[PDB]
Amino acid sequence: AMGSMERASLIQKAKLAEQAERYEDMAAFMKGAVEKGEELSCEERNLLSVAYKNVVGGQRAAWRVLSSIEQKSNEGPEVREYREKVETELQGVCDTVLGLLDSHLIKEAGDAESRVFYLKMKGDYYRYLAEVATGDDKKRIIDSARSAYQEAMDISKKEMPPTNPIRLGLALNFSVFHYEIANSPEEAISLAKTTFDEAMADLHTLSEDSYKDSTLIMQLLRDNLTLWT
Amino acid sequence: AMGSMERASLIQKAKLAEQAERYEDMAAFMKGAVEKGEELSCEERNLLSVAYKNVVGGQRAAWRVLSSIEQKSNEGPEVREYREKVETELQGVCDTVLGLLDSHLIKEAGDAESRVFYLKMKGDYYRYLAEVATGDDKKRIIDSARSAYQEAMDISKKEMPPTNPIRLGLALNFSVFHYEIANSPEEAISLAKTTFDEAMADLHTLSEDSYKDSTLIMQLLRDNLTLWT
Amino acid sequence: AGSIPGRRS
Amino acid sequence: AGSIPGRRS
Numbered sequence: 152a153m154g155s156m157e158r159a160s161l162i163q164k165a166k167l168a169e170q171a172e173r174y175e176d177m178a179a180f181m182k183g184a185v186e187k188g189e190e191l192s193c194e195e196r197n198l199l200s201v202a203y204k205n206v207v208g209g210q211r212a213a214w215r216v217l218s219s220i221e222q223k224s225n226e227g228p229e230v231r232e233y234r235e236k237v238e239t240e241l242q243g244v245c246d247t248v249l250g251l252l253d254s255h256l257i258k259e260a261g262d263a264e265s266r267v268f269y270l271k272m273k274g275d276y277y278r279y280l281a282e283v284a285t286g287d288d289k290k291r292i293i294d295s296a297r298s299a300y301q302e303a304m305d306i307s308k309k310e311m312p313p314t315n316p317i318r319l320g321l322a323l324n325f326s327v328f329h330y331e332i333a334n335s336p337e338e339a340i341s342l343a344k345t346t347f348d349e350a351m352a353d354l355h356t357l358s359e360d361s362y363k364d365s366t367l368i369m370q371l372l373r374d375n376l377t378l379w380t
Numbered sequence: 381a382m383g384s385m386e387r388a389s390l391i392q393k394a395k396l397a398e399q400a401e402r403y404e405d406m407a408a409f410m411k412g413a414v415e416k417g418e419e420l421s422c423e424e425r426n427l428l429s430v431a432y433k434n435v436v437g438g439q440r441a442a443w444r445v446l447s448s449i450e451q452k453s454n455e456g457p458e459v460r461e462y463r464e465k466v467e468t469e470l471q472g473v474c475d476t477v478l479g480l481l482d483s484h485l486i487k488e489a490g491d492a493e494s495r496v497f498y499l500k501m502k503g504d505y506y507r508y509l510a511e512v513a514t515g516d517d518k519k520r521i522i523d524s525a526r527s528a529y530q531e532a533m534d535i536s537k538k539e540m541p542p543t544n545p546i547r548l549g550l551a552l553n554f555s556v557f558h559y560e561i562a563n564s565p566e567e568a569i570s571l572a573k574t575t576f577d578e579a580m581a582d583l584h585t586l587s588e589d590s591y592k593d594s595t596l597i598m599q600l601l602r603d604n605l606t607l608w609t
Numbered sequence: 610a611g612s613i614p615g616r617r618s
Numbered sequence: 619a620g621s622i623p624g625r626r627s
């Protein structure tokens with residue numbers, strides 16, 4: 152649908168849409184930019200991720216409200232029907248993001264920073280699918296999230312310092328996966344603690360600005376550890 | 381598009397969409413309910429108004445962000461193009477609401493509470509069109525807002541007490557029209573002051589719950605008077 | 610200048 | 619449990 156707009160114009164409009172808090176538009180501009188077929192820069196990857204995180208974040212919040220109402224009513228068909236409508240929409244957005252990653256962002260990503268970023272996204276969007284999945288479907292979706300996060304972790308531990316913000320955010324989100332999806336709270340706690348401690352020990356190497364970036368995410372790891380222990 | 385869903389199911393889903401903060405869905409459910417052709421109850425009128433106020437409120441906020449960026453850049457075509465896209469979308473929503481009021485909510489509204497409510501809506505959505513209009517177009521749109529608000533005012537002063545919350549909100553919004561759209565700040569101030577004073581003098585007649593409802597809107601009139609004087 | 614918020618039923 | 623907020627560029 153964005154095929155007639157220049158790549159650079161899509162990127163410019165995605166930044167405008169962010170400023171206007173128009174995240175559906177932002178995501179559509181960044182989908183158009185990905186579909187131009189060129190690799191994404193660091194800033195462009197962040198625009199893609201921010202756009203879809205906001206879109207799916209609103210869907211997830213609405214799905215949770217509706218799921219809670221539906222569960223209370225099971226203690227007419229309308230609540231279930233509407234929860235199903237929101238759920239299908241959410242699944243469609245996750246499938247769209249996964250399809251961009253598969254066609255062809257991941258396979259073209261050779262540098263560790265890009266490949267880890269995209270594999271973390273792949274884990275995240277399978278995790279959002281897992282949040283709404285029920286049954287054996289849930290098993291295979293969970294394993295797809297796990298496999299994406301694990302490949303990202305393996306690359307990040309070989310190629311990035313322990314304070315790298317992508318490496319830290321990946322570990323944070325994989326720990327949430329373990330706690331909330333995989334029923335592995337001890338694995339979640341161990342990953343968050345090890346990640347925090349290894350980052351702490353590397354802070355001495357950082358500039359003031361990098362220190363701020365890394366310590367921000369470390370505080371999120373600590374916040375989860377405080378909630379989980 | 382909602383023609384196959386029962387009226388009562390549309391109403392139920394509009395309430396669920398409000399709880400989920402899904403205001404585009406809420407507006408589409410309430411449009412479907414209006415298009416069933418039956419008059420709306422008080423609660424249903426409020427659902428219709430809340431849904432569209434939230435939809436157009438987000439559009440207006442985005443249009444203002446983009447218009448500000450565009451004005452700074454005039455101190456490529458992308459900012460103007462995207463402001464135009466948001467503007468066209470906003471105009472489409474206002475035209476949809478105006479079309480529901482014209483086909484056929486206003487003509488079927490005989491009681492003062494319903495007729496004033498719908499005419500206040502008509503003034504509001506022409507006012508939102510006026511906010512983005514440029515030139516002679518702006519003149520005729522401004523007059524359409526004024527004419528709707530004036531008819532609502534005339535009915536409200538004959539048929540409702542000065543503390544009625546619809547009468548108060550109508551006067552508040554007409555005063556904003558005078559201040560922000562019609563370049564008549566003195567008319568805005570006089571209307572807000574007279575409305576506030578006549579409501580104050582009628583508060584003694586109200587129950588505790590009605591007192592709370594009326595004084596809330598009176599405080600909004602006072603807040604504007606404080607900003608304008 | 611604020612109009613009726615009108616965003617919550 | 620909070621994941622990366624990730625909502626602001």
Ligand SMILES: *Cc1ccc(S(=O)(=O)N2CCN(CC(C)C)CC2)cc1
Pocket residue numbers: 197200271316317319320321364367368622623624
């Ligand atoms: C998964 C991920 C995406 C992006 C980053 S980041 O660009 O380095 N950045 C880190 C800081 N963060 C602030 C919030 C409040 C956590 C925003 C994103 C890191 C990991």
Ligand SMILES: *Cc1ccc(S(=O)(=O)N2CCN(CC(C)C)CC2)cc1
Pocket residue numbers: 426429500545546548549550593596597613614615
């Ligand atoms: C234009 C209008 C619509 C609805 C009302 S109301 O149903 O009486 N109600 C009054 C209180 N208000 C609270 C906010 C914070 C002003 C919500 C709507 C009145 C006028």
Ligand SMILES: [Ca+2]
Pocket residue numbers: 157158
């Ligand atoms: Ca080109």
Ligand SMILES: [Ca+2]
Pocket residue numbers: 386387
């Ligand atoms: Ca019927």
